[PDB]
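Subject: complex prediction, re-run

Hi both,

The earlier run crashed halfway through, so I resubmitted it with identical inputs.
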Amino acid sequence: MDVFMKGLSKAKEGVVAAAEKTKQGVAEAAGKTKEGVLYVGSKTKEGVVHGVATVAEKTKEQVTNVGGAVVTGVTAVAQKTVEGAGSIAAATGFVKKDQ
Amino acid sequence: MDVFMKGLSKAKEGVVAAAEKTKQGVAEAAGKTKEGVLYVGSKTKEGVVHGVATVAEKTKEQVTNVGGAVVTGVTAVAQKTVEGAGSIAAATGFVKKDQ
Amino acid sequence: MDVFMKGLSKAKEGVVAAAEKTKQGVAEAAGKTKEGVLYVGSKTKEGVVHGVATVAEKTKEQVTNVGGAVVTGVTAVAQKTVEGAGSIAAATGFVKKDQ
Amino acid sequence: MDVFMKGLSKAKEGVVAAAEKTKQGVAEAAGKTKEGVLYVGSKTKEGVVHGVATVAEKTKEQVTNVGGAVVTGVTAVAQKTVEGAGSIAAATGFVKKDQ
Amino acid sequence: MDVFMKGLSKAKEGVVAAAEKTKQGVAEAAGKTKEGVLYVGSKTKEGVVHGVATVAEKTKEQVTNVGGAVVTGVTAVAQKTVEGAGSIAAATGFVKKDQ
Amino acid sequence: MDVFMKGLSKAKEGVVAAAEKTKQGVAEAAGKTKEGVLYVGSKTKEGVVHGVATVAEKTKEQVTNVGGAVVTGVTAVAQKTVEGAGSIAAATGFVKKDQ
Amino acid sequence: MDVFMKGLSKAKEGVVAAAEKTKQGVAEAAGKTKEGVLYVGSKTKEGVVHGVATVAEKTKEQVTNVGGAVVTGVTAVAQKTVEGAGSIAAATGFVKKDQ
Amino acid sequence: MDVFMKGLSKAKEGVVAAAEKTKQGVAEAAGKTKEGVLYVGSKTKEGVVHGVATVAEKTKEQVTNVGGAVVTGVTAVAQKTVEGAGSIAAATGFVKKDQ
Amino acid sequence: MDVFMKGLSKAKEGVVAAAEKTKQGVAEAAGKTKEGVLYVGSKTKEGVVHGVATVAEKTKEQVTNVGGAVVTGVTAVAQKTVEGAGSIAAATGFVKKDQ
Amino acid sequence: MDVFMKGLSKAKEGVVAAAEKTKQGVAEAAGKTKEGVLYVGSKTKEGVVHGVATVAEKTKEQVTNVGGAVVTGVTAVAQKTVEGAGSIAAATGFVKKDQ
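This time it finished cleanly. Structure:
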């Protein structure tokens, strides 16, 4: 009367292989201005800059020349992960009872 | 009378292979200005910039020349993942009882 | 009457292999202006800069020339992870009772 | 009547291999302006700079020339992790009762 | 009637291998302006600089020339981790009762 | 050829009496929130109170009981300028060439 | 050829009496929040109170009881400028060439 | 050819009496929060109180009881400028060539 | 050819009486928070109190009881400038060539 | 050809009486928080109190009881400038060529 999840009962020469959130050869990137943020009765004058900014309140003239490159952003690359023989195994099982 | 999920009962020479959220050779990217954000009675003057910005309140003249490139953004590439022989196995099982 | 998760009962010559959040050959990157932040009755004049900024309140003239490159951002690369033979195994099991 | 998680009962010649948050050949990077921050009735004039900044309150002229490169950001690379034979094993088990 | 987690009961010639947060060949980097910070009724004029900054309150002229490179940021690289034969094993077990 | 205003020419035994804006026994009152006011590019949060006020921005409960009198206003009284004989003369003239 | 204002020419035994803005027995009152005020690019949080005020920004409860009198205002009284005989004369003239 | 104002020419036994802004028995009062004020690029948090005030920014409870009188204001009284005989003369003239 | 103001020419036995801004028996009062004030690029947190004030920024409870009188204001009284005979003369002239 | 102001030419037995800003029996009062004040690029936290004040920044409880009288203000009284006979003369002239 066995209540089981992700397992095995009875049997003979049994193999159990379980992988949860198993990351192999992965690339992750994240850029977040706000995450898990809570404001309760708050007066905030905020300002986040990713690149080139020219900020003023009172001015007469205001120029912003960009002769070059402004490269901003979130990038993740998995260009190659497996080459030739071999393998990347997750939760792999076997029972070879040969002769 | 076994209540089981993602498993195996009885049998003989049994193999159980379970993979959940198993990421293999993956590329992930994320750019988020706000995630999981809560405002309760809050007065916020905010401002997020990803690139080139020219901000002012009172001005007479205001120019923004971009002679070059402004590359912004979220990119994820999986250009190659497997080359030649081999494999990327997740939750793979077998029972070869040959002779 | 065994209640079990991610395991194995009874059997004979059993193998249990479990991997949770097992990271192998992974690249992670994260850039976050705010994470897990709580404001309760707070008046904040904040300002985060990632790149080139020219900030003023009262001015007459205001220039910002960028002749070169401004490279900002979150990057993660898994260019190669496996070469040739071998493997990257997570939660892998076997029972070979041959002769 | 055994209640067990990530294990094994009964059996014979059993192997248990469990890996949790096992990081192998991984690269991690993180740049965060705020993490786990709590403001309760606080008046803060803050300012974080990652790059080149020109800050003023009262000015007449204000220039910011960038002839070169401003490279900012969070980067993580796993360029190679396995070469040739061998393996990176996590939670791997076996029972070979041959002759 | 054994209640056990990450283990093994009964059996014969049993092997238990458990790895938790076991870091092998990993590179970690982190740059955080604030972590675990609590403000309670505090008035703070703060300012963190990572790079080149030119800060003033009252000025007439204000220049900031960057002819060279300003490299800022959080980087972590796992360029190679395994070469040739061998292995990096975590929570690995076996029972070979051969002849 | 005399050009004259408020006067007298030629004649004989002449009397000239001129009164301009001559105020006698007068009561003047004035209450003005603004007079001769010029706003040029101005952001003003202003507030003038003449009496009883209860001002708040964020509240839960807000009561204002006035059990008594709130007397506000501009008043001016000329009650008894002349009594009995006499006079209040402005620009009064005479020529009595009797015997 | 005399050009004259508020005067007298030629004549004989002439009398000239001129009164300009001549105030006699007058009461003046003035209450002005602003007079001759110029704002040029100004950000002002102002607040003038004449009486009883209860000002707050963040509150839970806020009461203002006025059991008595709040008398505010601009008042001016000219009650008894002249009594009995006599006079209040302004710009008064005469020529009595009797015998 | 005489150009004259507020005067007298030619004549014989002439009398000139001129009164400008001549104040006699007058009461003046003035209450002004601002007069002849110039703001040029100014950020002012100001606050003028004439009476009873209760000012706060962050509070829980806030009461203001006025059991008595709050008398504020601008008052001016000219009650009995002249009594009995006599006079208040301004710019008064005469020529009595009798016998 | 005489150009004259507030005077007399030619004539014979002439009298000139001129009064400018001549104040006699006058009461003046003035209460001004600002007069002839110039702000040029100034950040001022100011606060003028005429009476009873209770000022705070952060509080829990805040009471202001006024059981008595709060008398504020600008007052001016001209109550009995002249009594009986006599006079208050300004710019008064005469020529009595009798016998 | 005489150009004259507030005077007399030609004539015979002439009298000139001139009074400018001649104050006789006058009461003057003035209360001014600011007069002839110039702010140029100045950051001032100022505060003027005329009466009873209770000032705090951070508090828990804050009471201000006024059981008595708070008399503030600008007052000026001209109550009995002239009594009986006599006079208050300003710029008074005469020519009595009798016999």
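Residues 17 and 82 of chain C are 22 Å apart (CA to CA).

- K.
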